[PDB]
Structure formats: structure tokens, C-alpha cells
């Protein structure tokens, strides 16, 4: 149509205007003002622990804010809560559906969420009054599979789904408080900022978006990648973030310059990134890959400075503890390992 | 101190003795993925046996779980990776459709050549043959104009069909089966096999076919432990 034609023309005109503004705001590369600092040398970690007890591949894993308790979700239908110091299993929740793809820990330590192909994020209470661990809630209302759940507090939770929409739920009531639309592909990962006012989300349309939780609108959009985005993580200060995609490339985007700062890639890498995470200082960027290995990148110099090669199958999840002391890694060979 | 640590060890031992009972049940079950072309006849097959529907059945004291994705989108390059440990993908193809047959062929080619589905075998059910017989005897619906090598194709010598069918039906069925088997014999890495069959809504032998095919899959899986 002619209306559709002029709408697409105006959209392209605004796109060109935004690109012009970005190129105007780009004066010096991050790799140009960082060449004066010294490199991190060589980072070589050792496998301190190895948690066994899962039957099938492990999709999710999330540290607790006490930096001691850990949760893992495997495809046999199990949600296991481990004590990471002494290796003892603290809980083992059996799930109603075997296809759990995500799991989360409450920042208070009282609840645990998990969702999957059943389009529901179930909330389990770990502190029942003289009872066992039983399901507290089942947040339903998504149309596609549930890719990520994240707690805001004991009463709010933000979820990503395979129907290209994110949602914000009030656990007490049980209905979607807010719905974040705009993506054109399945939303794969979401990341909360240090303060809980904003959060980023990556989808299968090779784009990432920044949402404000309270208003519910999209602030910024970042389109540096060229394939499906699998992993996303905020910088420790909340002014930048990092993504991993299937084009075998990680990217560090800025929230204030509104464009991509750094690219972490190597020609010898032809596998996609499944998970990314930052250390406590933000100088290290850990990235798990499909070639069964994990690579540590110098987030400022963009040069790889270590490898974590201990898993036999695809590295599915990867998480740094909230105090920066250990790194948990879960793979499709049904083993979580702690590195330090 | 020591009291909390011994309580934690008690809890861990109880959790582990429960996980053993759960592991013994997880190993006696064989999970199957029913992945039809959509409105292709998989509904009849699941009639014979939320976001995902599940059907449990039992053959000769062996337990089978069959999963079918429900409320999902038509894009399946992300939630299909969850089914790489499934022992078999049951792939239903509406053989009467011919362009849905090329769509099913492209789907089968993408599943066969996927990086994570490269060790998973496929039991292929070429359903809806009654309408195919109707259309090939009527001569109003053509396979020639959608598969230009239907002519020039001579029916193979093996696999004598049932005598109650018109030889043209046999020619069409074996043409489609060879169309799938060419992709299946595309060579390369994978360690997986295709077990094609000819079914209908009248059959009641399908669960035993799946049973025997899973038996052969498990046999070939065991046979790999005797190598390197």
C-alpha cells in the first residue's frame, strides 16, 4: 500500500537519522584508549568442586545472595539445591514437567522459581512452616515456552517467553502486572541491573532491548549482532552490558553512548556462546561455548586470557557468585563444577 | 559446629537414597518425541496409543512416554534442542499431501542434519495413504507436476507390497519413501538411522513397530560400547 510504503520510508529515514547520530557520537574506539593499561596476564583456574546427582542435562543454575547455596535444574525433572562449600544436597524438588529450561533463586533465599516448555513459572517455598518443600504458585499466561525467570523480590518476578514477549508478575495476586512487547523473535535471556529499575533482554532477532520496569516501555535498542542472541549480562555498575550470540562473537554494548563498544571474537572459534557473565570487578568476561569449553576474556583489552576445559558436553549455564569468589558451570553431561 | 553439619549429612543421605529410587525409574522409561507435520495424521496415531502434551503407554512391560508440543510457535530451532536425548523422533508425514510433502522433506532434512539431533534416530510414518490411492487412481491429482521425477522412476525390485493395492499406489509410496531415504542416506556424521514405515488410520500394529524399532536403536546403542 502507499500508506505502508510511506510508513516504511519514514521508518528508514528515522533509522538513518539514528545511525547518523550514533556515528557522530563515536570519536575513539574503546580499544584505542585502553592500549595504555597493562594486561591481566594469564588467568588459570582449577576445578575445586564437582557436584554430581543429576540424571540428564542441566539447563539452568543460579547462585544465592549468600554465595553459598546453589540451585540447578536438569531435564530429568529435578531442581536440586546444593550447599557449595560442603557439597551436601540441601533440597531436591521433583517437578511436574520434565522440560524445565530455567531456574532462579530469590534474593531473600526463601523462594525458588522454575519454568520450561509447559509455559508456566512455578514458585516453590523453601521455608514452609514445619513442612516439606511445596509449590507456592504457578504463574501461567504465556503462549510460548518460558526461557528465563528472575526475581525482583519475594513478590515480583520478570519472565522471558518464546512468544516474543516479556512479563512482570505479582506473585501474591498471580496476574501479569506488566507486559513488555516489541521483540520479533523468541526472547532467550534477560538480565536485571544492579538497581532493579531497568533490565535488558535478548531475542532471536539478533537484537537486545532495554526496558524500564515501572513504566513498561522500551528505552533503547541495540542491533550489533548478526544472529540469535543466547546470553546477556549487565556490567557491575549498570552502565553497559555484554551479549553472546550464535555467530561465535561476544559484544560489549554501552547504555549511554547507545552503541556497541567492544567485540570479543577469534577465528578459531566457530561455535556459539551459551552463557556470559562478569566478575566482581568487571574486568573478566566469562563465556561458555558449544565446543565444551569456557573462555575468559579481558573485558577491556578484548584478548582471551584463560580457558576452563573440564566438561564433556555443551556448556549450558555459567554463573559467577555475588562476592566474586567462585564460578559455577553446568553442562549437558549432568555435572556442575566450581572453579576458583 | 557439629550438630548442624550432622543434620546436613542426614538430609543429604536421605536425599541421595531418594535420588537412587528416582534414578531406577528414570532408566526404565523411554521417551519419544512425536513430531508430525501438523494436521498430517499424528492425531490419529496418538489416539491409537498446556505447552506440551504427554501420552504414556506400555508394550511387553516396557514403558514409553510420547511428547507432542502444543502451544508453541511455528519456529522450532530453540525448543527442539531439548529433545536430543529422546531415544526416537516419530515423524508423521501426510503422504496424501502433494505442497506439504516438500515442506515435510525440508523439515526432515533440517532435523537430520542438525548438530544436536545428529545422534537421534527417526521412525518415519508415511500416513494418509487412502487419499493417495484415491487420487492416484482418479488421476485428477498429480504427483508429476510437483515431483518431476515421478515418471522415469521405476519401482524397486525389493519390498513386495500387499496384493490388494493398485501397482501405481505402490509406485507412488515407494517414490516418496525413496525421497526421504535419499536425505537419510546423505552421508556424513550422525550415528543415527531412519526406520520408515507405511501406516494408515486402519492399522493397529504401530505401537509394536515403534517397540521393535526402539529395540533395534537400543541394540545399536549398546553395540557402540564394544568399540573404542
Amino acid at each position: 500500500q502507499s500508506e505502508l510504503d510511506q510508513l516504511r520510508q519514514e521508518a528508514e529515514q528515522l533509522k538513518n537519522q539514528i545511525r547518523d547520530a550514533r556515528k557522530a557520537c563515536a570519536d575513539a574506539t574503546l580499544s584505542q584508549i585502553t592500549n595504555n593499561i597493562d594486561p591481566v596476564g594469564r588467568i588459570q583456574m582449577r576445578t575445586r568442586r564437582t557436584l554430581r546427582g543429576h540424571l540428564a542435562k542441566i539447563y539452568a543454575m543460579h547462585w544465592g545472595t549468600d554465595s553459598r547455596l546453589l540451585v540447578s535444574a536438569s531435564q530429568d525433572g529435578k531442581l536440586i539445591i546444593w550447599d557449595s562449600y560442603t557439597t551436601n544436597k540441601v533440597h531436591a524438588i521433583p517437578l511436574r514437567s520434565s522440560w524445565v529450561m530455567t531456574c532462579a533463586y530469590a534474593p531473600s533465599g526463601n523462594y525458588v522459581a522454575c519454568g520450561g516448555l509447559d509455559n508456566i513459572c512455578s514458585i516453590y517455598n523453601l521455608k514452609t512452616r514445619e513442612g516439606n518443600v511445596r509449590v507456592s504458585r504457578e504463574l501461567a499466561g504465556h503462549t510460548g515456552y518460558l526461557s528465563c525467570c528472575r526475581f525482583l523480590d519475594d513478590n515480583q518476578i520478570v519472565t522471558s517467553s518464546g512468544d516474543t514477549t516479556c512479563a512482570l508478575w505479582d506473585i501474591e495476586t498471580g496476574q501479569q502486572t506488566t507486559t513488555f512487547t516489541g521483540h520479533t523473535g523468541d526472547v532467550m535471556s534477560l538480565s536485571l541491573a544492579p538497581d532493579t529499575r531497568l533490565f535488558v533482554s535478548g531475542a532471536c532477532d539478533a537484537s537486545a532491548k532495554l526496558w524500564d520496569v515501572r513504566e513498561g516501555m522500551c528505552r533503547q535498542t541495540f542491533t550489533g549482532h548478526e544472529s540469535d542472541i543466547n546470553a546477556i549480562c549487565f556490567f557491575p555498575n549498570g552502565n553497559a552490558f555484554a551479549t553472546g550470540s550464535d555467530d561465535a562473537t561476544c559484544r560489549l554494548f554501552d547504555l549511554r553512548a547507545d552503541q556497541e563498544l567492544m567485540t570479543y571474537s577469534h577465528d578459531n572459534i566457530i561455535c556459539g556462546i551459551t552463557s556470559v557473565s562478569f566478575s566482581k570487578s568487571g574486568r573478566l568476561l566469562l563465556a561458555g561455548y558449544d565446543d565444551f569449553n569456557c573462555n575468559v576474556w579481558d573485558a577491556l583489552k578484548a584478548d582471551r586470557a584463560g580457558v576452563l576445559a573440564g566438561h564433556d558436553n555443551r556448556v549450558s549455564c555459567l554463573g559467577v557468585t555475588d562476592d566474586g569468589m567462585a564460578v559455577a558451570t553446568g553442562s549437558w553431561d549432568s555435572f556442575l563444577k566450581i572453579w576458583n | 559446629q557439629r550438630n548442624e553439619e550432622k543434620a546436613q549429612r542426614e538430609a543429604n543421605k536421605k536425599i541421595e537414597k531418594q535420588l537412587q529410587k528416582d534414578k531406577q525409574v528414570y532408566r526404565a522409561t523411554h521417551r519419544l518425541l512425536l513430531l508430525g507435520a501438523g494436521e498430517s495424521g499424528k492425531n490419529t496415531i496418538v489416539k491409537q496409543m498446556s505447552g506440551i502434551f504427554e501420552t504414556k503407554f506400555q508394550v511387553d512391560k516396557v514403558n514409553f512416554h510420547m511428547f507432542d508440543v502444543g502451544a508453541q510457535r511455528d519456529e522450532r530451532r530453540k525448543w527442539i534442542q531439548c529433545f536430543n536425548d529422546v531415544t526416537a523422533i516419530i515423524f508423521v508425514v501426510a503422504s496424501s499431501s502433494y505442497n506439504r510433502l516438500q515442506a515435510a522433506l525440508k523439515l526432515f532434512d533440517s532435523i537430520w542434519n542438525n548438530k544436536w539431533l545428529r545422534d537421534t534416530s527417526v521412525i518415519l510414518f508415511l500416513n494418509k495413504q487412502d487419499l493417495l490411492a484415491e487420487k492416484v487412481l482418479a488421476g485428477k491429482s498429480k504427483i508429476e507436476d510437483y515431483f518431476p521425477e515421478f515418471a522415469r522412476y521405476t519401482t524397486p525390485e525389493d519390498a513386495t507390497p500387499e496384493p490388494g493395492e493398485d501397482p501405481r499406489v505402490t509406485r507412488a509410496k515407494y517414490f516418496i519413501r525413496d525421497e526421504f531415504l535419499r536425505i537419510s542416506t546423505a552421508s556424513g556424521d550422525g550415528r543415527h538411522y531412519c526406520y520408515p514405515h507405511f501406516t494408515c488410520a486402519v492399522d493397529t500394529e504401530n505401537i509394536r513397530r515403534v517397540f521393535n524399532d526402539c529395540r533395534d536403536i537400543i541394540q545399536r546403542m549398546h553395540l557402540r560400547q564394544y568399540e573404542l
Partner: nanobody
Amino acid sequence: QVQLQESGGGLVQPGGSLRLSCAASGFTFSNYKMNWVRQAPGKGLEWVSDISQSGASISYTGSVKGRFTISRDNAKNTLYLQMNSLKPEDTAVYYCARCPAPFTRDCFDVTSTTYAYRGQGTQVTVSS
């Protein structure tokens, strides 16, 4: 951004010839297997043809084999489809699609209703 701009369409008498072009930007064109798909009026999306990374492996659907020919220039990042002896049932909207992952031999959802790495397509009309 990942941009795929198709051109070359138009109205042509039955038996005529066309050459559709597809210009790509925002990705390494030589790492991806490319597809030509089409949507007919009142019908869904249909897979027409595809070509691999180097260009050695080429495939067409049944109803176009012998008439159309696909090709790719990795030096200029362009995908060409030459259509010969068109028929009245070739009138459709043609899309230039890229399948999502590089270096793979499988392209899953190029024919899905909402697919991100497609184009807007050109209308090819066959009439007299």
C-alpha cells in the same frame, strides 16, 4: 543491522524471463546458506530454492526444476535468481531469506510466518 533488500521484480508475459537480485548487509554473506522463498495470493509461504556457502550445493523445488537458476556473488554480497519461461502460477511475492546460523547445513524456520532474517520481497506478476 541485518538487511536484505530484494529487487528486480515486475510484470512479465507468460514464457518471459526475469532476474531477481538480493543485496545483503550487516553479516558475512559467505558464511550463510541462502534461500529464495515465495508466497502466493491466499496461500502460505513456500520454499523455492537454496544455495550453499560456496555455491556447489544447489537445490530447487519440484515445480521449478529446469526453469529457474540460483547463484551468489560473495565478492559483491548478492544473491541472484534467474527465472526463465515463467507460468501464470509463478505470480507471488518472492523473499530472500538467510537461515539463522552460520556454517550449518540445516536451515530451520526460513518458511515461518514471523522470521527475522527475511526480506520484504518483490512482487512477480505473470499475465498477458
